[PDB]
Write a protein that binds this ligand. Structure first.
Ligand SMILES: [Zn+2]
Length: 195
């Protein structure tokens, strides 16, 4: 099977938000609204904002999962390459095979679906803090898009789902991701090609 990637705000008006980091050669993570694509360096912080019109119930969670963007590769589980899954760089919670990790959240849970074998990381949804209007989750991508034997230059999409305590769908959003050496230059190049 293949997880749905259909945008769905749901009853709570759920949607993602990204910072405006620019395209300076030095940038480590930058989002392109025109391409709905996040460009980031290997294992660097990727801030993802969670916006809602109304607060969902306590027990609500937020899950992140990657799938290949190209339909001919959609059924293939996205995982870290043969090299990175063996580099012993786990933070003590993320299985070494998982591409996506959540930074600084001890309540993060990593799932290896017993039926689909797909990987995902889920955390409890926390309402915005006093003074804040959104909640932010910091993600890390643990392989380059170019890793041989892994993504192998194939583009991926990250699907973020808001779910209830049973795992039922409440909202969904998604974006393409390219993990590369120079996010600033690649974003500029791809946006130029689009122009
Ligand atoms: Zn890799």
């Amino acid at each position: 099977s293949v997880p749905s990637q259909k945008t769905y705000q749901g009853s709570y008006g759920f949607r993602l938000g990204f910072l405006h980091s620019g395209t300076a050669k030095s940038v480590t993570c930058t989002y392109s609204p025109a391409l709905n694509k996040l460009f980031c360096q290997l294992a660097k912080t990727c801030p993802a904002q969670l916006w809602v019109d109304s607060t969902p119930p306590p027990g609500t969670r937020v899950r992140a999962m990657a799938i290949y963007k190209q339909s001919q590769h959609m059924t293939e589980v996205v995982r870290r390459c043969p090299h990175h899954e063996r580099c012993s760089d786990s933070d003590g919670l993320a299985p070494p095979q998982h591409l996506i990790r959540v930074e600084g959240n001890l309540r993060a849970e990593y799932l290896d679906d017993r039926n689909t074998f797909r990987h995902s990381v889920v955390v409890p949804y926390e309402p915005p803090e006093v003074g804040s209007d959104c909640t932010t989750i910091h993600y890390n991508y643990m392989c380059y898009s170019s890793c041989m034997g892994g993504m192998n230059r194939r583009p991926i999409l990250t699907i973020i789902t808001l779910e209830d305590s049973s795992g039922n769908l409440l909202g969904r959003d998604s974006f393409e991701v390219r993990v590369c050496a120079c996010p600033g230059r690649d974003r500029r190049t791809e946006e130029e090609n689009l122009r």
